[PDB]
Ligand binder design. Structure first.
Ligand SMILES: C[C@]12CC[C@@H]3c4ccc(O)cc4CC[C@H]3[C@@H]1CC[C@@]2(O)C#Cc1ccc(N)cc1
Ligand SMILES: C[C@]12CC[C@@H]3c4ccc(O)cc4CC[C@H]3[C@@H]1CC[C@@]2(O)C#Cc1ccc(N)cc1
Lengths: 229, 9, 232, 9
Protein backbone atom coordinates (compact mmCIF):
# COMPACT_ATOMS: atom_id res chain seq x y z
CA UNK A 1 0.00 0.00 0.00
CA UNK A 2 2.77 2.41 0.96
CA UNK A 3 4.65 1.46 -2.22
CA UNK A 4 1.90 3.03 -4.38
CA UNK A 5 2.00 6.47 -2.75
CA UNK A 6 3.34 9.31 -4.88
CA UNK A 7 5.67 11.92 -3.42
CA UNK A 8 2.77 14.30 -2.74
CA UNK A 9 0.61 11.49 -1.36
CA UNK A 10 3.52 10.61 0.94
CA UNK A 11 3.85 14.18 2.24
CA UNK A 12 0.10 14.70 2.67
CA UNK A 13 -0.20 11.41 4.57
CA UNK A 14 2.65 12.36 6.90
CA UNK A 15 1.32 15.89 7.46
CA UNK A 16 -2.20 14.64 8.26
CA UNK A 17 -0.68 12.20 10.78
CA UNK A 18 1.15 14.89 12.76
CA UNK A 19 0.48 14.57 16.51
CA UNK A 20 -0.58 17.64 18.48
CA UNK A 21 1.71 19.84 20.54
CA UNK A 22 0.78 19.01 24.12
CA UNK A 23 0.84 21.42 27.06
CA UNK A 24 2.87 21.24 30.26
CA UNK A 25 1.67 21.57 33.85
CA UNK A 26 4.13 24.42 34.41
CA UNK A 27 3.17 27.09 36.93
CA UNK A 28 4.99 28.03 40.89
CA UNK A 29 8.09 27.18 42.99
CA UNK A 30 10.42 25.02 40.92
CA UNK A 31 12.80 22.42 42.30
CA UNK A 32 15.18 20.68 39.90
CA UNK A 33 13.14 17.55 40.58
CA UNK A 34 9.91 19.43 39.85
CA UNK A 35 11.25 20.72 36.54
CA UNK A 36 12.17 17.16 35.56
CA UNK A 37 8.76 15.87 36.63
CA UNK A 38 7.11 18.28 34.20
CA UNK A 39 9.33 17.00 31.37
CA UNK A 40 8.78 13.31 32.14
CA UNK A 41 5.04 13.87 32.56
CA UNK A 42 4.98 15.66 29.21
CA UNK A 43 7.02 12.93 27.50
CA UNK A 44 4.67 10.25 28.85
CA UNK A 45 1.59 11.98 27.43
CA UNK A 46 3.42 12.55 24.14
CA UNK A 47 4.28 8.83 23.95
CA UNK A 48 0.58 7.97 23.64
CA UNK A 49 0.22 10.24 20.61
CA UNK A 50 3.48 9.04 19.06
CA UNK A 51 2.27 5.42 19.21
CA UNK A 52 -0.89 6.32 17.28
CA UNK A 53 1.13 8.55 14.94
CA UNK A 54 3.40 5.61 14.11
CA UNK A 55 0.43 3.51 12.96
CA UNK A 56 -0.37 6.31 10.48
CA UNK A 57 3.17 6.27 9.03
CA UNK A 58 2.99 4.33 5.72
CA UNK A 59 4.31 0.79 5.98
CA UNK A 60 4.48 0.68 9.78
CA UNK A 61 1.22 -1.28 10.11
CA UNK A 62 2.43 -3.82 7.52
CA UNK A 63 4.99 -4.96 10.12
CA UNK A 64 4.57 -7.56 12.84
CA UNK A 65 3.56 -6.38 16.30
CA UNK A 66 6.95 -7.56 17.57
CA UNK A 67 8.78 -5.36 15.06
CA UNK A 68 6.45 -2.41 15.67
CA UNK A 69 7.26 -2.66 19.38
CA UNK A 70 10.99 -2.91 18.68
CA UNK A 71 11.09 0.11 16.37
CA UNK A 72 9.24 2.24 18.93
CA UNK A 73 11.34 1.05 21.88
CA UNK A 74 14.49 2.18 20.05
CA UNK A 75 13.27 5.41 18.43
CA UNK A 76 10.82 6.95 20.92
CA UNK A 77 13.34 9.37 22.45
CA UNK A 78 14.84 10.35 19.08
CA UNK A 79 11.32 11.23 17.89
CA UNK A 80 10.60 13.27 21.02
CA UNK A 81 13.90 15.09 20.52
CA UNK A 82 13.45 15.93 16.83
CA UNK A 83 9.93 17.19 17.57
CA UNK A 84 11.22 19.38 20.40
CA UNK A 85 14.03 20.63 18.14
CA UNK A 86 11.50 21.32 15.37
CA UNK A 87 9.09 23.46 17.41
CA UNK A 88 12.04 25.22 19.08
CA UNK A 89 13.45 26.41 15.74
CA UNK A 90 11.84 29.87 15.79
CA UNK A 91 13.06 30.42 19.39
CA UNK A 92 16.85 30.92 19.24
CA UNK A 93 18.62 29.93 22.43
CA UNK A 94 15.48 28.37 23.93
CA UNK A 95 13.85 24.94 24.01
CA UNK A 96 10.06 24.83 23.62
CA UNK A 97 9.07 21.63 25.39
CA UNK A 98 5.51 23.01 25.50
CA UNK A 99 3.92 26.33 24.46
CA UNK A 100 3.84 27.35 28.14
CA UNK A 101 7.26 25.73 28.79
CA UNK A 102 10.02 27.71 27.04
CA UNK A 103 13.37 26.91 28.67
CA UNK A 104 16.64 28.76 28.05
CA UNK A 105 20.15 27.46 28.71
CA UNK A 106 20.17 28.89 32.24
CA UNK A 107 23.11 18.62 36.86
CA UNK A 108 24.53 17.30 33.60
CA UNK A 109 21.30 18.18 31.79
CA UNK A 110 23.05 21.28 30.39
CA UNK A 111 24.98 18.96 28.07
CA UNK A 112 21.75 17.55 26.61
CA UNK A 113 20.26 21.05 26.47
CA UNK A 114 23.17 22.55 24.51
CA UNK A 115 23.11 19.64 22.06
CA UNK A 116 19.38 20.10 21.44
CA UNK A 117 19.95 23.84 21.01
CA UNK A 118 22.72 23.20 18.47
CA UNK A 119 20.40 20.87 16.56
CA UNK A 120 17.71 23.57 16.55
CA UNK A 121 20.17 26.19 15.30
CA UNK A 122 21.32 23.77 12.60
CA UNK A 123 17.71 23.25 11.48
CA UNK A 124 17.14 27.02 11.49
CA UNK A 125 20.32 27.68 9.49
CA UNK A 126 19.31 25.10 6.87
CA UNK A 127 15.77 26.57 6.70
CA UNK A 128 14.25 23.16 7.40
CA UNK A 129 10.71 22.82 6.05
CA UNK A 130 7.77 21.05 7.64
CA UNK A 131 7.47 18.62 4.72
CA UNK A 132 11.13 17.71 5.28
CA UNK A 133 10.68 17.41 9.05
CA UNK A 134 7.86 14.87 8.77
CA UNK A 135 10.02 12.82 6.39
CA UNK A 136 13.03 12.85 8.72
CA UNK A 137 10.87 11.87 11.70
CA UNK A 138 9.40 8.87 9.85
CA UNK A 139 12.90 7.85 8.72
CA UNK A 140 14.01 7.81 12.37
CA UNK A 141 11.11 5.52 13.30
CA UNK A 142 11.88 3.04 10.52
CA UNK A 143 15.70 3.17 10.62
CA UNK A 144 16.63 3.36 14.32
CA UNK A 145 15.66 -0.24 15.06
CA UNK A 146 16.04 -1.98 11.71
CA UNK A 147 19.62 -3.07 12.51
CA UNK A 148 18.64 -4.83 15.76
CA UNK A 149 16.05 -7.29 14.38
CA UNK A 150 15.47 -15.84 12.35
CA UNK A 151 15.11 -15.86 8.57
CA UNK A 152 11.46 -14.91 7.96
CA UNK A 153 12.71 -11.48 7.81
CA UNK A 154 11.26 -9.14 5.24
CA UNK A 155 13.09 -6.15 6.53
CA UNK A 156 13.59 -5.23 2.87
CA UNK A 157 10.03 -3.92 3.22
CA UNK A 158 11.35 -1.27 5.62
CA UNK A 159 14.18 -0.41 3.23
CA UNK A 160 11.61 -0.25 0.42
CA UNK A 161 9.64 2.32 2.42
CA UNK A 162 12.88 4.08 3.40
CA UNK A 163 13.78 4.45 -0.28
CA UNK A 164 10.28 5.81 -0.90
CA UNK A 165 10.79 8.51 1.73
CA UNK A 166 14.22 9.27 0.25
CA UNK A 167 12.59 9.86 -3.14
CA UNK A 168 10.12 12.12 -1.33
CA UNK A 169 12.88 14.26 0.19
CA UNK A 170 14.50 14.63 -3.24
CA UNK A 171 11.15 15.48 -4.83
CA UNK A 172 10.72 18.22 -2.22
CA UNK A 173 14.14 19.77 -2.87
CA UNK A 174 13.66 19.62 -6.65
CA UNK A 175 10.46 21.65 -6.19
CA UNK A 176 12.38 24.29 -4.20
CA UNK A 177 14.55 24.98 -7.26
CA UNK A 178 17.67 23.18 -6.01
CA UNK A 179 20.02 21.72 -8.60
CA UNK A 180 20.81 18.00 -8.59
CA UNK A 181 24.03 18.76 -6.72
CA UNK A 182 22.20 20.86 -4.11
CA UNK A 183 19.55 18.15 -3.66
CA UNK A 184 22.16 15.49 -2.93
CA UNK A 185 24.09 17.77 -0.55
CA UNK A 186 20.99 18.82 1.39
CA UNK A 187 19.83 15.19 1.59
CA UNK A 188 23.20 14.25 3.09
CA UNK A 189 23.16 17.19 5.52
CA UNK A 190 19.72 16.19 6.84
CA UNK A 191 20.59 12.52 7.34
CA UNK A 192 23.91 13.28 9.04
CA UNK A 193 21.98 15.24 11.67
CA UNK A 194 20.17 11.99 12.50
CA UNK A 195 23.50 10.67 13.78
CA UNK A 196 23.65 13.52 16.30
CA UNK A 197 20.01 12.86 17.23
CA UNK A 198 20.94 9.24 17.93
CA UNK A 199 23.84 10.51 20.04
CA UNK A 200 21.54 12.78 22.04
CA UNK A 201 19.09 9.91 22.55
CA UNK A 202 21.77 7.56 23.88
CA UNK A 203 23.02 10.21 26.30
CA UNK A 204 19.40 10.81 27.30
CA UNK A 205 18.85 7.12 28.05
CA UNK A 206 21.87 7.16 30.37
CA UNK A 207 20.35 10.14 32.20
CA UNK A 208 16.92 8.47 32.28
CA UNK A 209 18.44 5.30 33.77
CA UNK A 210 19.89 7.46 36.56
CA UNK A 211 16.48 9.03 37.20
CA UNK A 212 14.68 5.70 37.61
CA UNK A 213 16.28 8.41 42.21
CA UNK A 214 13.24 10.33 43.43
CA UNK A 215 11.75 11.86 40.25
CA UNK A 216 8.82 9.58 39.39
CA UNK A 217 8.35 7.86 36.05
CA UNK A 218 5.24 6.42 34.45
CA UNK A 219 4.75 2.72 33.78
CA UNK A 220 4.97 3.17 30.01
CA UNK A 221 8.08 5.33 30.38
CA UNK A 222 9.74 2.65 32.52
CA UNK A 223 9.00 -0.02 29.91
CA UNK A 224 10.68 2.10 27.23
CA UNK A 225 13.61 2.44 29.65
CA UNK A 226 14.06 -1.32 30.11
CA UNK A 227 14.45 -1.82 26.35
CA UNK A 228 17.78 0.04 26.09
CA UNK A 229 19.01 -1.39 29.41
CA UNK B 1 3.80 -4.64 28.00
CA UNK B 2 1.93 -1.34 27.70
CA UNK B 3 3.47 -0.58 24.30
CA UNK B 4 1.94 -3.79 22.94
CA UNK B 5 -1.57 -3.10 24.25
CA UNK B 6 -1.49 0.50 23.02
CA UNK B 7 -0.46 -0.68 19.54
CA UNK B 8 -3.35 -3.17 19.58
CA UNK B 9 -5.97 -0.41 19.91
CA UNK C 1 41.08 25.93 2.01
CA UNK C 2 42.82 23.43 -0.29
CA UNK C 3 40.45 20.45 -0.04
CA UNK C 4 37.65 22.30 -1.86
CA UNK C 5 39.66 22.49 -5.11
CA UNK C 6 40.16 18.75 -5.63
CA UNK C 7 38.13 16.87 -8.18
CA UNK C 8 36.06 13.81 -7.33
CA UNK C 9 38.81 11.44 -8.48
CA UNK C 10 41.53 13.44 -6.71
CA UNK C 11 39.52 13.12 -3.49
CA UNK C 12 39.13 9.34 -3.87
CA UNK C 13 42.83 8.88 -4.63
CA UNK C 14 43.85 11.06 -1.68
CA UNK C 15 41.63 9.14 0.75
CA UNK C 16 42.78 5.75 -0.55
CA UNK C 17 46.45 6.72 -0.21
CA UNK C 18 45.82 7.85 3.39
CA UNK C 19 44.44 4.47 4.49
CA UNK C 20 46.06 3.18 7.71
CA UNK C 21 47.51 -0.34 7.67
CA UNK C 22 45.81 -3.45 9.00
CA UNK C 23 47.62 -4.08 12.28
CA UNK C 24 48.15 -7.48 13.88
CA UNK C 25 47.16 -8.80 17.28
CA UNK C 26 49.59 -10.34 19.75
CA UNK C 27 50.31 -13.88 18.56
CA UNK C 28 50.43 -17.25 20.37
CA UNK C 29 46.69 -17.11 21.11
CA UNK C 30 46.02 -19.60 23.94
CA UNK C 31 40.64 -20.20 24.21
CA UNK C 32 40.46 -16.63 25.53
CA UNK C 33 39.31 -15.50 28.95
CA UNK C 34 37.57 -12.23 29.77
CA UNK C 35 40.78 -10.47 30.84
CA UNK C 36 42.96 -11.84 28.03
CA UNK C 37 40.52 -11.17 25.18
CA UNK C 38 39.95 -7.61 26.39
CA UNK C 39 43.69 -7.04 26.74
CA UNK C 40 44.26 -8.03 23.12
CA UNK C 41 41.45 -5.76 21.92
CA UNK C 42 42.53 -2.70 23.91
CA UNK C 43 46.17 -3.24 22.98
CA UNK C 44 45.11 -3.33 19.32
CA UNK C 45 42.85 -0.28 19.64
CA UNK C 46 45.64 1.79 21.21
CA UNK C 47 48.09 1.01 18.39
CA UNK C 48 45.44 1.78 15.76
CA UNK C 49 44.74 5.17 17.37
CA UNK C 50 48.30 6.28 16.57
CA UNK C 51 47.76 5.43 12.89
CA UNK C 52 44.28 6.98 12.92
CA UNK C 53 45.72 10.28 14.18
CA UNK C 54 48.10 10.36 11.21
CA UNK C 55 45.36 9.17 8.85
CA UNK C 56 43.17 12.07 9.98
CA UNK C 57 45.94 14.57 9.22
CA UNK C 58 45.92 13.21 5.65
CA UNK C 59 42.16 13.71 5.20
CA UNK C 60 41.91 16.73 2.85
CA UNK C 61 40.84 19.81 4.79
CA UNK C 62 41.42 18.29 8.24
CA UNK C 63 44.70 20.19 8.66
CA UNK C 64 43.02 23.50 7.80
CA UNK C 65 41.21 23.15 11.15
CA UNK C 66 42.36 24.50 14.49
CA UNK C 67 44.31 22.11 16.71
CA UNK C 68 41.44 22.36 19.21
CA UNK C 69 38.93 21.40 16.51
CA UNK C 70 41.09 18.50 15.32
CA UNK C 71 41.28 17.28 18.92
CA UNK C 72 37.52 17.58 19.38
CA UNK C 73 36.65 15.70 16.18
CA UNK C 74 39.00 12.80 16.94
CA UNK C 75 37.89 12.65 20.58
CA UNK C 76 34.27 12.21 19.47
CA UNK C 77 34.73 9.95 16.44
CA UNK C 78 37.68 7.66 17.26
CA UNK C 79 35.54 4.69 18.31
CA UNK C 80 33.20 5.04 15.33
CA UNK C 81 36.25 5.07 13.04
CA UNK C 82 37.65 1.94 14.67
CA UNK C 83 34.27 0.24 14.28
CA UNK C 84 33.66 1.11 10.62
CA UNK C 85 37.15 -0.16 9.85
CA UNK C 86 36.54 -3.41 11.74
CA UNK C 87 33.19 -3.80 9.98
CA UNK C 88 34.82 -3.05 6.62
CA UNK C 89 37.57 -5.68 6.83
CA UNK C 90 35.06 -8.17 8.29
CA UNK C 91 32.88 -7.99 5.16
CA UNK C 92 34.31 -11.04 3.38
CA UNK C 93 34.17 -13.08 6.62
CA UNK C 94 30.45 -13.47 7.37
CA UNK C 95 29.62 -14.31 10.96
CA UNK C 96 33.10 -13.28 12.10
CA UNK C 97 34.79 -10.01 13.08
CA UNK C 98 38.30 -9.51 11.72
CA UNK C 99 39.82 -7.42 14.49
CA UNK C 100 43.22 -8.43 13.11
CA UNK C 101 44.40 -10.94 10.47
CA UNK C 102 45.41 -13.19 13.40
CA UNK C 103 42.32 -12.36 15.52
CA UNK C 104 39.11 -13.48 13.77
CA UNK C 105 36.26 -13.86 16.26
CA UNK C 106 32.66 -15.05 16.01
CA UNK C 107 29.60 -14.42 18.17
CA UNK C 108 30.38 -17.43 20.37
CA UNK C 109 33.77 -16.02 21.40
CA UNK C 110 32.09 -12.71 22.27
CA UNK C 111 30.44 -14.39 25.27
CA UNK C 112 33.75 -14.53 27.16
CA UNK C 113 33.01 -10.91 28.15
CA UNK C 114 29.58 -10.04 29.53
CA UNK C 115 27.61 -7.58 27.43
CA UNK C 116 29.99 -8.01 24.48
CA UNK C 117 27.63 -10.31 22.57
CA UNK C 118 25.30 -7.33 22.05
CA UNK C 119 28.09 -5.21 20.53
CA UNK C 120 29.26 -8.24 18.55
CA UNK C 121 25.84 -8.85 16.98
CA UNK C 122 25.55 -5.14 16.20
CA UNK C 123 28.97 -5.14 14.52
CA UNK C 124 28.19 -8.37 12.63
CA UNK C 125 24.90 -6.92 11.38
CA UNK C 126 26.61 -3.79 10.05
CA UNK C 127 29.14 -5.93 8.16
CA UNK C 128 26.33 -8.01 6.64
CA UNK C 129 24.60 -4.78 5.62
CA UNK C 130 27.72 -3.53 3.83
CA UNK C 131 28.18 -6.94 2.22
CA UNK C 132 24.55 -6.96 1.07
CA UNK C 133 24.99 -3.46 -0.39
CA UNK C 134 28.26 -4.50 -2.10
CA UNK C 135 30.12 -1.63 -0.45
CA UNK C 136 33.14 -0.52 -2.46
CA UNK C 137 36.44 0.63 -1.01
CA UNK C 138 36.08 4.05 -2.62
CA UNK C 139 32.76 4.46 -0.80
CA UNK C 140 34.26 3.20 2.47
CA UNK C 141 36.97 5.87 2.75
CA UNK C 142 34.35 8.54 2.03
CA UNK C 143 32.11 7.28 4.83
CA UNK C 144 35.01 7.01 7.28
CA UNK C 145 36.14 10.60 6.70
CA UNK C 146 32.51 11.74 6.92
CA UNK C 147 32.40 10.20 10.40
CA UNK C 148 35.54 12.14 11.35
CA UNK C 149 34.17 15.50 10.24
CA UNK C 150 30.49 15.09 11.17
CA UNK C 151 30.57 13.29 14.54
CA UNK C 152 31.83 16.31 16.48
CA UNK C 153 30.74 19.26 14.36
CA UNK C 154 27.51 19.69 16.36
CA UNK C 155 29.35 20.03 19.70
CA UNK C 156 32.32 25.27 11.33
CA UNK C 157 31.27 26.31 7.82
CA UNK C 158 34.57 24.95 6.48
CA UNK C 159 33.84 21.49 7.92
CA UNK C 160 30.37 21.45 6.35
CA UNK C 161 31.90 22.67 3.07
CA UNK C 162 34.22 19.65 3.09
CA UNK C 163 31.29 17.36 3.96
CA UNK C 164 29.43 18.59 0.87
CA UNK C 165 32.46 17.77 -1.28
CA UNK C 166 32.76 14.23 0.11
CA UNK C 167 29.04 13.93 -0.64
CA UNK C 168 29.70 14.99 -4.24
CA UNK C 169 32.46 12.38 -4.26
CA UNK C 170 30.01 9.71 -3.09
CA UNK C 171 27.52 10.58 -5.85
CA UNK C 172 30.38 10.66 -8.37
CA UNK C 173 31.27 7.06 -7.47
CA UNK C 174 27.69 5.80 -7.79
CA UNK C 175 27.27 7.56 -11.13
CA UNK C 176 30.53 5.87 -12.18
CA UNK C 177 29.15 2.39 -11.45
CA UNK C 178 26.19 3.08 -13.77
CA UNK C 179 23.59 3.76 -11.08
CA UNK C 180 20.63 5.86 -12.20
CA UNK C 181 19.75 9.15 -10.51
CA UNK C 182 17.12 7.41 -8.38
CA UNK C 183 19.58 4.66 -7.41
CA UNK C 184 22.26 7.23 -6.54
CA UNK C 185 20.37 9.23 -3.92
CA UNK C 186 18.77 6.06 -2.54
CA UNK C 187 22.16 4.38 -2.05
CA UNK C 188 23.52 7.63 -0.61
CA UNK C 189 20.70 7.66 1.95
CA UNK C 190 21.18 3.99 2.83
CA UNK C 191 24.90 4.49 3.49
CA UNK C 192 24.44 7.61 5.63
CA UNK C 193 21.67 6.07 7.75
CA UNK C 194 24.06 3.25 8.67
CA UNK C 195 26.23 5.94 10.27
CA UNK C 196 23.44 6.46 12.80
CA UNK C 197 23.79 2.83 13.89
CA UNK C 198 27.59 3.17 13.98
CA UNK C 199 27.08 6.13 16.30
CA UNK C 200 24.81 3.95 18.43
CA UNK C 201 27.38 1.14 18.62
CA UNK C 202 30.08 3.63 19.65
CA UNK C 203 27.95 5.04 22.48
CA UNK C 204 27.29 1.52 23.75
CA UNK C 205 31.00 0.74 23.47
CA UNK C 206 31.99 3.85 25.41
CA UNK C 207 29.88 2.78 28.40
CA UNK C 208 31.63 -0.60 28.41
CA UNK C 209 35.03 1.10 28.14
CA UNK C 210 34.11 3.33 31.08
CA UNK C 211 32.94 0.36 33.17
CA UNK C 212 36.19 -1.28 32.04
CA UNK C 213 38.36 1.48 33.51
CA UNK C 214 36.29 1.27 36.70
CA UNK C 215 37.23 -2.44 36.83
CA UNK C 216 41.04 -1.96 36.67
CA UNK C 217 41.43 -5.62 35.67
CA UNK C 218 42.41 -5.12 32.02
CA UNK C 219 44.91 -2.26 31.63
CA UNK C 220 44.07 0.76 29.48
CA UNK C 221 46.71 2.99 27.93
CA UNK C 222 47.00 6.66 28.84
CA UNK C 223 46.09 7.65 25.28
CA UNK C 224 43.05 5.35 25.35
CA UNK C 225 42.07 6.76 28.75
CA UNK C 226 42.32 10.36 27.51
CA UNK C 227 39.99 9.61 24.60
CA UNK C 228 37.64 8.01 27.15
CA UNK C 229 37.84 10.98 29.53
CA UNK C 230 36.70 13.32 26.74
CA UNK C 231 33.32 11.55 26.59
CA UNK C 232 32.67 11.79 30.35
CA UNK D 1 47.26 15.67 26.52
CA UNK D 2 48.83 12.93 24.40
CA UNK D 3 46.46 13.67 21.51
CA UNK D 4 48.04 17.13 21.20
CA UNK D 5 51.53 15.69 20.71
CA UNK D 6 50.61 13.14 18.05
CA UNK D 7 48.57 15.67 16.06
CA UNK D 8 51.59 18.00 15.94
CA UNK D 9 54.13 15.25 15.19
C1 LIG E 1 14.40 12.18 28.75
C2 LIG E 1 14.60 13.65 29.21
C3 LIG E 1 13.29 14.17 29.83
C4 LIG E 1 12.20 14.40 28.76
C5 LIG E 1 12.67 15.32 27.61
C6 LIG E 1 11.63 15.63 26.53
C7 LIG E 1 10.32 15.73 26.84
C8 LIG E 1 9.39 16.00 25.91
C9 LIG E 1 9.73 16.18 24.63
O1 LIG E 1 8.81 16.45 23.67
C10 LIG E 1 11.04 16.08 24.32
C11 LIG E 1 11.98 15.81 25.24
C12 LIG E 1 13.42 15.72 24.77
C13 LIG E 1 14.44 15.77 25.90
C14 LIG E 1 13.98 14.79 26.99
C15 LIG E 1 15.03 14.62 28.09
C16 LIG E 1 16.44 14.13 27.71
C17 LIG E 1 17.00 13.58 29.04
C18 LIG E 1 15.87 13.76 30.07
O2 LIG E 1 15.93 12.78 31.08
C19 LIG E 1 15.98 15.09 30.70
C1 LIG F 1 36.39 -0.72 22.21
C2 LIG F 1 35.96 -2.20 22.26
C3 LIG F 1 37.25 -3.05 22.36
C4 LIG F 1 38.16 -2.86 21.10
C5 LIG F 1 37.46 -3.01 19.72
C6 LIG F 1 38.23 -2.69 18.43
C7 LIG F 1 39.56 -2.90 18.32
C8 LIG F 1 40.22 -2.62 17.18
C9 LIG F 1 39.59 -2.13 16.10
O1 LIG F 1 40.24 -1.85 14.94
C10 LIG F 1 38.28 -1.93 16.20
C11 LIG F 1 37.60 -2.20 17.33
C12 LIG F 1 36.12 -1.91 17.29
C13 LIG F 1 35.35 -2.57 18.43
C14 LIG F 1 36.11 -2.26 19.72
C15 LIG F 1 35.35 -2.76 20.94
C16 LIG F 1 33.84 -2.56 21.00
C17 LIG F 1 33.65 -3.07 22.43
C18 LIG F 1 34.72 -2.28 23.21
O2 LIG F 1 34.22 -0.98 23.46
C19 LIG F 1 34.76 -2.93 24.55
C20 LIG F 1 34.50 -3.38 25.64
C21 LIG F 1 34.05 -3.92 26.76
C22 LIG F 1 32.94 -4.66 26.67
C23 LIG F 1 32.42 -5.25 27.76
C24 LIG F 1 33.01 -5.10 28.95
N1 LIG F 1 32.57 -5.63 30.02
C25 LIG F 1 34.13 -4.35 29.04
C26 LIG F 1 34.65 -3.75 27.95
Amino acid sequence: LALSLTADQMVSALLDAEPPILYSEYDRPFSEASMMGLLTNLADRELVHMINWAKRVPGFVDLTLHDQVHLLECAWLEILMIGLVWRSMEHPGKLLFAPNLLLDRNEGMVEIFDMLLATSSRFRMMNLQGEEFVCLKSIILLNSGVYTFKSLEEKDHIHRVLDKITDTLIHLMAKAGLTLQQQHQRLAQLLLILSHIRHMSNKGMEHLYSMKNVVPLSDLLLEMLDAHR
Amino acid sequence: KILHRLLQD
